[PDB]
Amino acid sequence: MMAPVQKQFREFHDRIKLAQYDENQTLRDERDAVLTAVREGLKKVFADRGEAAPTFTPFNQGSYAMNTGVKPLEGGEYDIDVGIILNIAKDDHDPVEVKKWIRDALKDYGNGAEIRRSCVTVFKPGYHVDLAVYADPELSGGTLCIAKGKENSGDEHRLWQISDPQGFQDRIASKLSGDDAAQFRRCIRYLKRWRDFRFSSDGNAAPLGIGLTAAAYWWFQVSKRTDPVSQNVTYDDRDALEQFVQTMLDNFHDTWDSKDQRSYPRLTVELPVQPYNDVFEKMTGMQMESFKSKLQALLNALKTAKSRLELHDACKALADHFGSEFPVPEK
């Protein structure tokens, strides 16, 4: 019979997983250090403009909140994500000016703060912290809106966009339960490491991690066998990934580009909460074509790793796509 690889997938998962906020005091300390720095810097910035310092409520976001965190590759950085809800009315403030408040509050913290399209990012040796900045729902008509735009943007690209990070986190945490939910989380982490490993030559071309997570929310199916007599359950991560990657490939659509006068294959993945946008909408046709080509090659490897006599060959076929931390036993 062909070599199984379930034990090597579980070992790979143990190697790549990074503990979520609730189980990771180091990440809590680093997050909280940045939040105390923003309180200190806000007292400074708003005392300098004769106004009372605005207050904020922080909350956990991103993969360290949803228990889908992966360790970076060497030379990579941890990505600590937090939202802060300022006690302001969105209709009274430009979103970029508000982000300027936060960045100036973090002027001399670590390696300096920086205003991105989605957030204020602060850098330290080994990690960055993304602060997504929101206006107060109570003062802004009951909607949670994130500050979009940077210092570059014209009026069209400076906006308070309706957002629901906690809704998205809840959807990911609740899609399944128990050992089924554990397989779901493992397969998201496997594809996050695939993303890091096979998109390193051009990071700007990589699919957003939130995009792969939303794709899993739409299309992941548990793969397990239940012995009908003993009721014993054994999970099959290789098959779960094979069915999920084939479902994503099935959902690419050749999409005509009038500028280039050609088609590009495009995968559309809607967020299952507000604003329900296609998360991959900013990827170019060329990046999509390369995304689809690497997904097809991953699928081919997953099928190869079902039909090897030698565990070595099955594992090496997977390691070609998941990288040097995927276990390859000696022949």
From TrEMBL:
Binding site residues for UTP 1: Q61, D81, R117, S118, C119
Keyword Chaperone applies: no
The organism's place on the tree of life at top rank: Bacteria
TM spans (from-to): none
Positions bound to Mn(2+): D79, D81, D130
GO function terms (MF aspect): ATP binding; GTP binding; metal ion binding; nucleotidyltransferase activity
Cyclic GMP-AMP synthase DncV-like nucleotidyltransferase domain sequence ranges: 59-134
Record bears the keyword Metal-binding: yes
Binding-site residues, UTP 3: S63, K192, R195, I210
Positions with a binding annotation for dATP 1: S63, K192, R195, N277
Residues annotated to bind GTP 2: R117, S118, C119, Y134
UniProt: UTP 2 binding residues: Q61, R116, R117, S118, C119, K150
Binding site for ATP 1: S63, K192, R195, N277
Catalytic activity from the UniProt record: GTP + ATP = 3',3'-cGAMP + 2 diphosphate
CDD domains membership: NT_2-5OAS_ClassI-CCAase
Sites where the protein binds CTP 3: D81, R117, S118, C119, D130
Record: residues binding CTP 2: S63, K192, R195
Keyword annotations: Antiviral defense, ATP-binding, GTP-binding, Magnesium, Metal-binding, Nucleotide metabolism, Nucleotide-binding, Nucleotidyltransferase, Plasmid, Transferase
Any one GO biological process: defense response to virus
InterPro entries from the UniProt entry: DncV-like_NTFase, NT_2-5OAS_ClassI-CCAase
Binding site for ATP 2: D81, R116, R117, S118, C119
Positions contributing to GTP 1 binding: S63, K192, R195, N277
Listed name of the protein: Cyclic GMP-AMP synthase
